[PDB]
Amino acid sequence: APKAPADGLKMDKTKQPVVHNHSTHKAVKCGDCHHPVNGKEDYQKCATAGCHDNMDKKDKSAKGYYHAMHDKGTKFKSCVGCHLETAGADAAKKKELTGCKGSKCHS
Numbered sequence: 001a002p003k004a005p006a007d008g009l010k011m012d013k014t015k016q017p018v019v020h021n022h023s024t025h026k027a028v029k030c031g032d033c034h035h036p037v038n039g040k041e042d043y044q045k046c047a048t049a050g051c052h053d054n055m056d057k058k059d060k061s062a063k064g065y066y067h068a069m070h071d072k073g074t075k076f077k078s079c080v081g082c083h084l085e086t087a088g089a090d091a092a093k094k095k096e097l098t099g100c101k102g103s104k105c106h107s
């Protein structure tokens with residue numbers, strides 16, 4: 001089985017880079033994020049060519065990188081989508097986990 005990498009991983013395809021820690025996500029199954037493609041969980045970098053390689057932040061296709069990290073209603077929960085559910089009605093956790101600035105994702 002593939003192993004989780006070290007914490008402190010920077011996602012840096014954009015000018016708004018974000019650090020991802022596997023240890024804080026250890027209760028989420030690996031394949032919720034490294035989701036099936038052609039029937040197999042895919043552990044390539046999310047923006048690999050042919051994957052979420054469209055860097056237009058307005059794109060909502062299966063290639064849109066921004067969309068895959070921020071939007072609701074997606075086949076797999078996105079970073080923000082899952083965090084909204086986690087925060088619930090708690091506005092402090094909404095700021096921390098889903099705020100566009102001043103949050104745990106973006107300063």
Ligand code: HEM
Nearest residue numbers: 002003004005011020025028029030033043044045046047
């Ligand atoms: C579950 C224990 C689990 C495994 C296994 C796993 C593996 C993994 C690898 C091998 C990488 C590095 C990919 C590379 O070649 O650089 C990696 C990276 C990311 N992961 Fe992961 N991962 C596991 C679990 C989870 C969970 C539960 C999430 C989602 C909450 C998740 C997400 C990510 C992200 C994002 C990356 C960075 C990929 C990128 O920037 O393209 N992982 N993981």
Ligand code: HEM
Nearest residue numbers: 033034037042044045046050051062068074075076077078
């Ligand atoms: C990297 C860890 C990674 C993330 C994050 C990610 C997210 C993601 C979401 C949120 C969706 C749903 C979008 C929607 O509008 O429903 C989604 C869908 C697909 N992805 Fe993805 N994805 C990550 C990694 C990868 C990799 C490495 C590839 C390419 C091999 C890839 C591809 C796709 C495709 C295709 C879809 C659509 C799948 C289908 O409808 O069953 N993703 N991804």
Ligand code: HEM
Nearest residue numbers: 018019020021024025028032077078079082083086104105
């Ligand atoms: C998507 C790639 C993604 C990112 C980025 C991300 C970030 C993140 C941060 C920065 C935290 C705070 C802790 C830390 O610094 O590591 C955090 C915390 C939680 N997350 Fe997350 N997260 C991403 C994805 C997802 C997804 C897809 C889920 C659920 C399916 C999820 C869940 C959680 C949970 C739960 C936490 C803990 C919340 C807290 O209050 O302590 N994340 N994430």
Ligand code: HEM
Nearest residue numbers: 011012013014016017018057069079080097098099100105
């Ligand atoms: C709040 C809804 C919110 C906004 C708005 C937002 C914006 C934003 C921008 C403009 C980028 C860069 C896009 C580009 O291509 O130029 C970006 C990138 C990432 N974000 Fe974000 N973001 C908002 C909220 C959050 C939160 C709360 C998280 C984490 C749960 C998060 C995550 C990400 C990730 C991952 C990226 C990509 C980082 C990279 O590869 O450089 N965003 N966001």
